[PDB]
Design a protein around this ligand. Structure first.
Ligand SMILES: NS(=O)(=O)c1ccccc1
Ligand SMILES: NS(=O)(=O)c1ccccc1
Ligand SMILES: [Zn+2]
Length: 257
């Protein structure tokens, strides 16, 4: 099954998930000189004061922190979105080296990592119905660069010991995802897809211009995770990112001049 290695990596995905070669795939390179400012964009609204994290999971491809999404406790709205999108999980992608790791790129620049706060459109009732819709998900993408430590990430970094291998999960309650946001909400937006199989084209992407800084030590601990299960041969979870895909017939809009 799919992964990131030479034999089951992003160039193989299309054989089991033909939409890999589709019309609105993610990630993409964000050409900052081609992105247009869009005055029709309403202000973005991230309302996470009531977020309830539950658990953290190594799924063999990344780790995810999952949230209770049985009510309107953590929601994204505004910007390009119509309606209310509920936070369900965040996932991270990172590199083997500080010069690579992000899925999206900005004028071909790769960041050390990328965070996705994944939200589903409450008009579709559940996450699994939402992914079957062209406007079913809204994902907030945040770049990580290596520099100063991010205090608000350390609780994540510290629990990774307990979820080293594929299929391990741990309790992860009372984690405040607001601690992972940069100061500015200036963003670029375009229509795209999940960046892992099944690669469904159900995402409004909202990619923040301002990266967060994390320390070398923080990102180093990401790189100690394993893709393999417990008692299998150790394969470090690194370079779990898909490269940029053709833009095709899409425009990236900017929220800012
Ligand atoms: N990556 S994929 O098309 O799902 C795949 C499945 C099995 C073996 C190799 C690759
Ligand atoms: N990594 S992503 O596009 O945000 C994604 C979100 C949910 C399921 C699978 C992938
Ligand atoms: Zn992701």
């Amino acid at each position: 099954h799919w992964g990131y290695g030479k034999h089951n990596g992003p160039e193989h995905w299309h054989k089991d998930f033909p939409i890999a070669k589709g019309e609105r795939q993610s990630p993409v390179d964000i050409d900052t000189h081609t992105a247009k400012y869009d005055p029709s964009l309403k202000p973005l609204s991230v309302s996470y004061d009531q977020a309830t994290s539950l658990r953290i999971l190594n799924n063999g491809h990344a780790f995810n922190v999952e949230f209770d999404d049985s009510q309107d406790k953590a929601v994204l709205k505004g910007g390009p979105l119509d309606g209310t999108y509920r936070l369900i999980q965040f996932c991270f992608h990172w590199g083997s080296l500080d010069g690579q790791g992000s899925e999206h790129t900005v004028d071909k620049k790769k960041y050390a990592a990328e965070l996705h706060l994944v939200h589903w459109n409450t008009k579709y009732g559940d996450f699994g119905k939402a992914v079957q819709q062209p406007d079913g998900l809204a994902v907030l993408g945040i770049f990580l660069k290596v520099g100063s430590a991010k205090p608000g990430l350390q609780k994540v970094v510290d629990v990774l010991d307990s979820i080293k291998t594929k299929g391990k999960s741990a309790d992860f309650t009372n984690f405040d995802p607001r601690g992972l946001l940069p100061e500015s909400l200036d963003y670029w937006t375009y229509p795209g897809s999940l960046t892992t199989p099944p690669l469904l084209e159900c995402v409004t992407w909202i990619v923040l211009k301002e990266p967060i800084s994390v320390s070398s030590e923080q990102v180093l601990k990401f790189r100690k995770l394993n893709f393999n299960g417990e008692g299998e041969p150790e394969e470090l979870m690194v370079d779990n990112w898909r490269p940029a895909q053709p833009l095709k017939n899409r425009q990236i809009k900017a929220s800012f001049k």
